[PDB]
Amino acid sequence: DAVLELPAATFDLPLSLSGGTQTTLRAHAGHWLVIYFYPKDSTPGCTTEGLDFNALLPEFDKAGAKILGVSRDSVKSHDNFCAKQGFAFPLVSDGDEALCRAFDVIKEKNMYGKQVLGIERSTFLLSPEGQVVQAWRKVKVAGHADAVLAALKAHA
Ligand code: NA
Ligand code: NA
């Protein structure tokens, strides 16, 4: 039932959060976890995605699920983003792209006559036992949080 196998070490990676604290994926054992990766703080599309998730938090709560947003922006950037938008869930500052690489969301595009890497918008649903049970890659923002919520409800 897993759609992705993560390196065992992934679950113990210390993840720097907005607010200045740290978590690990293992610390989330016992409940569903939505991990949504987005390319950049404070852009039109990534703001829309975050506000969409934020609007649905109570529905995520009803399933005991928690949300984590992830990009490679700094904690400070995350703090500003979260404050400005009123997010009620944490953002991981994956500055070294450790979590991104673990989920294989760093993708390459041949453009400008060179190989350019970047974060591909992607979302994953992690079971209470830490299994990746569903994945969405190259995500289109419109309707995404709704679809993730629906999928969560179906799995839970
Ligand atoms: Na860190
Ligand atoms: Na979990």
Side-chain angles (χ1 to χ4, degrees), residues 114 116-132:
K114 41 206 275 182
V116 177
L117 296 186
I119 294 169
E120 178 168 276
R121 196 181 287 110
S122 304
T123 300
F124 305 84
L125 182 59
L126 192 64
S127 74
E129 302 85 22
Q131 281 205 139
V132 182

PDB file of all heavy atoms in Angstrom, residues 114-132, unseen atoms left out:
ATOM      1  N   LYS A 114      20.863  25.256 -20.266  1.00  0.00           N
ATOM      2  CA  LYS A 114      21.474  24.608 -19.104  1.00  0.00           C
ATOM      3  C   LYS A 114      20.471  23.701 -18.358  1.00  0.00           C
ATOM      4  O   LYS A 114      19.314  23.678 -18.659  1.00  0.00           O
ATOM      5  CB  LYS A 114      22.100  25.640 -18.182  1.00  0.00           C
ATOM      6  CG  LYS A 114      21.324  26.908 -17.957  1.00  0.00           C
ATOM      7  CD  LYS A 114      22.262  28.048 -17.592  1.00  0.00           C
ATOM      8  CE  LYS A 114      22.553  28.063 -16.121  1.00  0.00           C
ATOM      9  NZ  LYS A 114      23.436  29.197 -15.762  1.00  0.00           N
ATOM     10  N   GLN A 115      20.976  22.931 -17.425  1.00  0.00           N
ATOM     11  CA  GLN A 115      20.165  22.018 -16.611  1.00  0.00           C
ATOM     12  C   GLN A 115      19.817  22.765 -15.348  1.00  0.00           C
ATOM     13  O   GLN A 115      20.688  23.046 -14.548  1.00  0.00           O
ATOM     14  CB  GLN A 115      20.912  20.719 -16.302  1.00  0.00           C
ATOM     15  N   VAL A 116      18.536  23.060 -15.169  1.00  0.00           N
ATOM     16  CA  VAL A 116      18.121  23.845 -14.002  1.00  0.00           C
ATOM     17  C   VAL A 116      17.272  23.043 -13.011  1.00  0.00           C
ATOM     18  O   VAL A 116      16.222  22.508 -13.373  1.00  0.00           O
ATOM     19  CB  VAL A 116      17.385  25.130 -14.427  1.00  0.00           C
ATOM     20  CG1 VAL A 116      16.891  25.887 -13.203  1.00  0.00           C
ATOM     21  CG2 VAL A 116      18.285  26.009 -15.282  1.00  0.00           C
ATOM     22  N   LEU A 117      17.726  22.965 -11.765  1.00  0.00           N
ATOM     23  CA  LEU A 117      16.983  22.236 -10.742  1.00  0.00           C
ATOM     24  C   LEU A 117      16.003  23.157 -10.022  1.00  0.00           C
ATOM     25  O   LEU A 117      16.219  24.365  -9.935  1.00  0.00           O
ATOM     26  CB  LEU A 117      17.932  21.579  -9.733  1.00  0.00           C
ATOM     27  CG  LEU A 117      18.871  20.501 -10.276  1.00  0.00           C
ATOM     28  CD1 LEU A 117      19.647  19.834  -9.145  1.00  0.00           C
ATOM     29  CD2 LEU A 117      18.091  19.469 -11.084  1.00  0.00           C
ATOM     30  N   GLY A 118      14.914  22.579  -9.527  1.00  0.00           N
ATOM     31  CA  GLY A 118      13.966  23.304  -8.696  1.00  0.00           C
ATOM     32  C   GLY A 118      12.960  22.383  -8.033  1.00  0.00           C
ATOM     33  O   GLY A 118      12.873  21.203  -8.374  1.00  0.00           O
ATOM     34  N   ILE A 119      12.217  22.919  -7.069  1.00  0.00           N
ATOM     35  CA  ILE A 119      11.186  22.163  -6.378  1.00  0.00           C
ATOM     36  C   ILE A 119       9.958  22.038  -7.260  1.00  0.00           C
ATOM     37  O   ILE A 119       9.408  23.040  -7.726  1.00  0.00           O
ATOM     38  CB  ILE A 119      10.813  22.815  -5.035  1.00  0.00           C
ATOM     39  CG1 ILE A 119      11.994  22.771  -4.065  1.00  0.00           C
ATOM     40  CG2 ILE A 119       9.577  22.141  -4.442  1.00  0.00           C
ATOM     41  CD1 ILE A 119      11.792  23.611  -2.821  1.00  0.00           C
ATOM     42  N   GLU A 120       9.538  20.802  -7.502  1.00  0.00           N
ATOM     43  CA  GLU A 120       8.287  20.561  -8.202  1.00  0.00           C
ATOM     44  C   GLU A 120       7.157  20.496  -7.185  1.00  0.00           C
ATOM     45  O   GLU A 120       7.218  19.697  -6.250  1.00  0.00           O
ATOM     46  CB  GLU A 120       8.363  19.239  -8.959  1.00  0.00           C
ATOM     47  CG  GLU A 120       7.087  18.849  -9.695  1.00  0.00           C
ATOM     48  CD  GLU A 120       7.311  17.694 -10.647  1.00  0.00           C
ATOM     49  OE1 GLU A 120       7.747  17.941 -11.789  1.00  0.00           O
ATOM     50  OE2 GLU A 120       7.052  16.540 -10.251  1.00  0.00           O
ATOM     51  N   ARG A 121       6.114  21.269  -7.383  1.00  0.00           N
ATOM     52  CA  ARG A 121       4.994  21.261  -6.461  1.00  0.00           C
ATOM     53  C   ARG A 121       4.446  19.872  -6.341  1.00  0.00           C
ATOM     54  O   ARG A 121       4.076  19.326  -7.329  1.00  0.00           O
ATOM     55  CB  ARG A 121       3.931  22.261  -6.903  1.00  0.00           C
ATOM     56  CG  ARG A 121       2.930  22.587  -5.828  1.00  0.00           C
ATOM     57  CD  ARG A 121       1.837  23.576  -6.269  1.00  0.00           C
ATOM     58  NE  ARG A 121       2.358  24.913  -6.381  1.00  0.00           N
ATOM     59  CZ  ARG A 121       2.510  25.521  -7.488  1.00  0.00           C
ATOM     60  NH1 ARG A 121       2.132  24.945  -8.618  1.00  0.00           N
ATOM     61  NH2 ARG A 121       3.019  26.724  -7.452  1.00  0.00           N
ATOM     62  N   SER A 122       4.414  19.353  -5.117  1.00  0.00           N
ATOM     63  CA  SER A 122       4.092  17.943  -4.901  1.00  0.00           C
ATOM     64  C   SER A 122       3.527  17.802  -3.503  1.00  0.00           C
ATOM     65  O   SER A 122       3.899  18.555  -2.590  1.00  0.00           O
ATOM     66  CB  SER A 122       5.359  17.073  -4.986  1.00  0.00           C
ATOM     67  OG  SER A 122       6.030  17.246  -6.214  1.00  0.00           O
ATOM     68  N   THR A 123       2.661  16.820  -3.313  1.00  0.00           N
ATOM     69  CA  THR A 123       2.031  16.628  -2.015  1.00  0.00           C
ATOM     70  C   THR A 123       1.963  15.152  -1.721  1.00  0.00           C
ATOM     71  O   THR A 123       1.808  14.335  -2.647  1.00  0.00           O
ATOM     72  CB  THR A 123       0.606  17.219  -2.001  1.00  0.00           C
ATOM     73  OG1 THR A 123       0.691  18.620  -2.271  1.00  0.00           O
ATOM     74  CG2 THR A 123      -0.061  17.009  -0.662  1.00  0.00           C
ATOM     75  N   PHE A 124       2.087  14.815  -0.443  1.00  0.00           N
ATOM     76  CA  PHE A 124       2.077  13.427  -0.021  1.00  0.00           C
ATOM     77  C   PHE A 124       1.227  13.221   1.219  1.00  0.00           C
ATOM     78  O   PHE A 124       1.205  14.059   2.123  1.00  0.00           O
ATOM     79  CB  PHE A 124       3.505  12.922   0.221  1.00  0.00           C
ATOM     80  CG  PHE A 124       4.412  13.117  -0.953  1.00  0.00           C
ATOM     81  CD1 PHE A 124       5.046  14.330  -1.159  1.00  0.00           C
ATOM     82  CD2 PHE A 124       4.619  12.086  -1.863  1.00  0.00           C
ATOM     83  CE1 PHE A 124       5.870  14.521  -2.250  1.00  0.00           C
ATOM     84  CE2 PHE A 124       5.437  12.259  -2.954  1.00  0.00           C
ATOM     85  CZ  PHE A 124       6.069  13.478  -3.154  1.00  0.00           C
ATOM     86  N   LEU A 125       0.556  12.076   1.281  1.00  0.00           N
ATOM     87  CA  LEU A 125      -0.249  11.713   2.443  1.00  0.00           C
ATOM     88  C   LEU A 125       0.429  10.578   3.209  1.00  0.00           C
ATOM     89  O   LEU A 125       0.602   9.481   2.680  1.00  0.00           O
ATOM     90  CB  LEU A 125      -1.650  11.288   2.006  1.00  0.00           C
ATOM     91  CG  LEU A 125      -2.627  10.934   3.123  1.00  0.00           C
ATOM     92  CD1 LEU A 125      -2.802  12.118   4.059  1.00  0.00           C
ATOM     93  CD2 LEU A 125      -3.970  10.507   2.529  1.00  0.00           C
ATOM     94  N   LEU A 126       0.809  10.855   4.456  1.00  0.00           N
ATOM     95  CA  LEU A 126       1.566   9.911   5.276  1.00  0.00           C
ATOM     96  C   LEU A 126       0.674   9.301   6.356  1.00  0.00           C
ATOM     97  O   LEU A 126       0.106  10.033   7.168  1.00  0.00           O
ATOM     98  CB  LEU A 126       2.731  10.647   5.946  1.00  0.00           C
ATOM     99  CG  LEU A 126       3.819   9.810   6.618  1.00  0.00           C
ATOM    100  CD1 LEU A 126       4.545   8.970   5.579  1.00  0.00           C
ATOM    101  CD2 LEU A 126       4.796  10.714   7.367  1.00  0.00           C
ATOM    102  N   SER A 127       0.568   7.971   6.388  1.00  0.00           N
ATOM    103  CA  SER A 127      -0.327   7.319   7.343  1.00  0.00           C
ATOM    104  C   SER A 127       0.170   7.508   8.778  1.00  0.00           C
ATOM    105  O   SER A 127       1.313   7.925   8.997  1.00  0.00           O
ATOM    106  CB  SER A 127      -0.437   5.819   7.038  1.00  0.00           C
ATOM    107  OG  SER A 127       0.750   5.135   7.419  1.00  0.00           O
ATOM    108  N   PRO A 128      -0.685   7.187   9.761  1.00  0.00           N
ATOM    109  CA  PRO A 128      -0.256   7.225  11.165  1.00  0.00           C
ATOM    110  C   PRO A 128       0.943   6.311  11.453  1.00  0.00           C
ATOM    111  O   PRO A 128       1.590   6.464  12.490  1.00  0.00           O
ATOM    112  CB  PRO A 128      -1.487   6.712  11.908  1.00  0.00           C
ATOM    113  CG  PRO A 128      -2.644   7.108  11.027  1.00  0.00           C
ATOM    114  CD  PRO A 128      -2.133   6.931   9.628  1.00  0.00           C
ATOM    115  N   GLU A 129       1.282   5.402  10.588  1.00  0.00           N
ATOM    116  CA  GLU A 129       2.413   4.555  10.771  1.00  0.00           C
ATOM    117  C   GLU A 129       3.559   4.973   9.896  1.00  0.00           C
ATOM    118  O   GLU A 129       4.500   4.282   9.787  1.00  0.00           O
ATOM    119  CB  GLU A 129       1.979   3.133  10.482  1.00  0.00           C
ATOM    120  CG  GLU A 129       0.811   2.624  11.344  1.00  0.00           C
ATOM    121  CD  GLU A 129      -0.639   2.960  10.875  1.00  0.00           C
ATOM    122  OE1 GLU A 129      -0.962   3.258   9.689  1.00  0.00           O
ATOM    123  OE2 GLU A 129      -1.530   2.878  11.732  1.00  0.00           O
ATOM    124  N   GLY A 130       3.442   6.099   9.247  1.00  0.00           N
ATOM    125  CA  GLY A 130       4.537   6.656   8.470  1.00  0.00           C
ATOM    126  C   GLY A 130       4.713   6.112   7.062  1.00  0.00           C
ATOM    127  O   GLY A 130       5.799   6.212   6.488  1.00  0.00           O
ATOM    128  N   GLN A 131       3.653   5.530   6.508  1.00  0.00           N
ATOM    129  CA  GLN A 131       3.692   5.079   5.126  1.00  0.00           C
ATOM    130  C   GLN A 131       3.167   6.160   4.192  1.00  0.00           C
ATOM    131  O   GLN A 131       2.179   6.841   4.495  1.00  0.00           O
ATOM    132  CB  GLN A 131       2.898   3.781   4.936  1.00  0.00           C
ATOM    133  CG  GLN A 131       3.662   2.542   5.392  1.00  0.00           C
ATOM    134  CD  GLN A 131       3.203   1.265   4.705  1.00  0.00           C
ATOM    135  OE1 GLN A 131       4.160   0.416   4.343  1.00  0.00           O
ATOM    136  NE2 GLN A 131       2.007   1.041   4.504  1.00  0.00           N
ATOM    137  N   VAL A 132       3.845   6.331   3.062  1.00  0.00           N
ATOM    138  CA  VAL A 132       3.374   7.241   2.028  1.00  0.00           C
ATOM    139  C   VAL A 132       2.319   6.510   1.210  1.00  0.00           C
ATOM    140  O   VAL A 132       2.637   5.627   0.411  1.00  0.00           O
ATOM    141  CB  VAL A 132       4.524   7.742   1.141  1.00  0.00           C
ATOM    142  CG1 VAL A 132       3.996   8.721   0.117  1.00  0.00           C
ATOM    143  CG2 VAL A 132       5.631   8.372   1.992  1.00  0.00           C
TER     144      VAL A 132
END
